[model samples]
Target: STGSATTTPIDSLDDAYITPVQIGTPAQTLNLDFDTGSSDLWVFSSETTASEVDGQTIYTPSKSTTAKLLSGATWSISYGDGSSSSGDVYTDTVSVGGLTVTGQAVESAKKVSSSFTEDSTIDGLLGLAFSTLNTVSPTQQKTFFDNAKASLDSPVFTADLGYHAPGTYNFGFIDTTAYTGSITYTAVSTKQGFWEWTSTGYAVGSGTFKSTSIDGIADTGTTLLYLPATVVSAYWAQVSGAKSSSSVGGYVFPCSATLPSFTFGVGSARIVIPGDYIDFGPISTGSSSCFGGIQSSAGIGINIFGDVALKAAFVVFNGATTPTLGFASK
Candidate 1:
């Protein structure tokens, strides 16, 4: 009963990425942010406050023939940025691309913070992190991937994120044709409920690679890469007038600065980040300063390898036993 599913990521608001998911019997489709940093498959639904349901589509459990309420079950989640969501729960059939899992936990958001309310297109989040991070109370719930893994030939998925273009997310199967070169794998530690791994070292600009093993999480939902303040400073030092600013929140440099590429180690191979990707975008529209895409992980607790770093590689999330990660250049 090996199953497979493929999804295309929607580059959102120049910051995040999203994948479409289908829920319930008749399958009401919604665009969800596939987050590897979390483990709750929650969504904006008919149960959500009407005022917050403006641009987002609501999952109608009443209309679905297969949807059933999980009595008294509740779920609540809060993000690092203070955004939050909480509500009742339902057990329904959830599917992605071609793979479908029945009786999957779908937490319906009856309440949401302004962060989610202001974002129009994001219907909700489909967490791809470990099942241990699921927020369901009373009895913990498993993720869609966890439920589907039992039927997969190999419990694995791959993410090929693109730059401002649609990328593919494959479940239960990996398409070799999607990437070039061999994939380099590194052991992942799931103790923190993330695909956390340590890189052997890094090379800044044209400098020699330094053995500074850095531990971080691979987060597709995050927009930018975050590292230690020291690491952030080292890379931006090459930029003209690149300095840490309170107003900007991170490093900002002259728009015309010719940035140098940043490369990091994975196993014995390397993942080199293009110089242009470091210049996130203009600090302000029509402004002369551009914000650096890489920032300090100071308050976040751990470093995060967001889209800026992931887009350069074809990432594999192996869930078989150890949850090791594989990265290949595209």
Candidate 2:
């Protein structure tokens, strides 16, 4: 069996992508962030503190007859961007697209950080990464993908993220028409509980491709493309007024700067990110300085190929005995 879901970007900047998910017996629907960066299917729920709940939709287990509390179980997770949430656990019928999973762990949020509360576009996160990264204590839980993989036509899921418009997430089968060019496959390492892989090299604009091994994770949850300082510096150098500013964080350039596109090698294939994507947006409202979509990952420990890179290609997360990733130009 296979299923598909429409993922829509929250705002003009494409800050985050959300997809509707049906949970519980009565089919209470909530728009969840399909995140590959972390494992923990958490949501804003009835248990959440009133002050922490903004305009975001909340999942109320009491309203669902099939909901069952996971006795003594709890979970907590913190992201690289410093946002965090923690809560008790519940098992209920959860459905993504048309794929259904009974007794799926549904973490009900008791507390959440300010960042999550302020961002009302997403109700919670539906983790797509390996279940090894699940944060629940005592006994970790399987992610929705893991639980549903066996019954699926193939143990895989594909991501087709959009620039500003709506994209799609296909489960179990790869849509041949979704991508153009042949798919370039690579081995994935789940050692760090991530869909980690190494790229052959990268090229700045239309310049020569510098052959250097770059290791990073395909993180749909993250917002930008993060690379080594040297690679990031090389790309920014081409811009006339680019500089790494501590106050605004990472690299920033004049809004009027002529931005250049970035290209990265996947095996022998090259995927290009348009210059407009790198321009990002103004540092602040009415400000002349614009933040870069690509930044240095030195402080983050490992590089992250986030939405900025994922949006440029069709990505396949193959959940086999030995996982692999497939990239194709779309």
Candidate 3:
């Protein structure tokens, strides 16, 4: 089944930007975010300029003989975060989980900004969200999914954004074992290259946003849940003592106890966003303590449901057939 594309207007900040995904193996495994906004699977390289390659983990091709480079093409990607990287493009054999794709286009950045360098845990980005956003040259612009789809046993890619605990993001094939029998499918919207959805309304704890419904998209590329102001305010209102704080970038909030669980219904399936995923760091101003889920994104034309919301359920993108999204249990 394919996923549906829904539209809503909400101003989203950079808070919901990226989420980490595991790649390679346990001994040599690397944690990278799966980005659909831009294509080009790139990791930090030891040869990268000190300024650009500071906080991110550079992939050492020397570490594994499987790495390869695409002759003379150069590549660069500037994220919405103001961080940028530029390097040479090459083809390498990339392995994720038990699946492997040979001659895959990989970017080798020789220069990256310090903003991306400071985050030590951030190594690289895996752009599995779509093929149109790929960074490779037009002639060579192929996403990891494009190549893997042909080889997948079931011809389906499943993204299980695990919440709180470490979750598995599977490629190449769909594992039916992680899901219950019920699978609701939505058709993909052909407009922009995002997985859009039409949600009936949002539900927090036991209260539901019946009068106010939301239409938007879900992206692994984003890190947090971006919602409309009315919806955001209403959500916080339902959560006892939920107050917004500017110190945490305005979208964050603080409460004495565990906030009520928030859920948004799409068709027959309901997506639940836990409280811990809403807040970041400590509770002080500019410190970190804040709301974990459901932040305000009033003016932005798009509400990006990031990993915080996606990690709760098992997501399958069936782009092979007609571009559909299927949700199942993880």
- Name the lDDT value of residue 185 in candidate 3: 76
Writing each residue's lDDT as its tens digit, candidate 3 over 3-32 gives 211111111322323333323322245556
The model with the greatest lDDT is 2
Alpha-carbon runs more than 4 Å astray in model 1 = 1-13
- Please tell me which model should have the higher lDDT, number 1 or number 2: 2
lDDT of 2 by residue, 1-330 (tens): 888999999999988899999999899999999999899999999999999999999999999999999999999999999999999999999998998999999999999999999999999999998899999998999999999989999999999999988999999999999999899999899999999999999999989999999999999999999999999999999999899999999899999988999999888998999988787789899999999999999989999999999999999999988999999998
Better of 2 and 3 by lDDT: 2
Residue-level lDDT tens digits of model 1 in 197-305: 9988888889989888899999988888899988898898888798999987888999888989888889889998888777776888899898888899999999999
What's the true lDDT of residue 307 in model 1? 83
Name the lDDT of candidate 3.
Answer: 0.64
Those runs of model 2 whose alpha carbons end farther than 4 Å from true positions after fitting are none
Per-residue lDDT of 312 in model 1: 82
Q: Quick one: how many clashes does candidate 3 have?
A: 36
Error of 1 at 11 (Å): 5.0
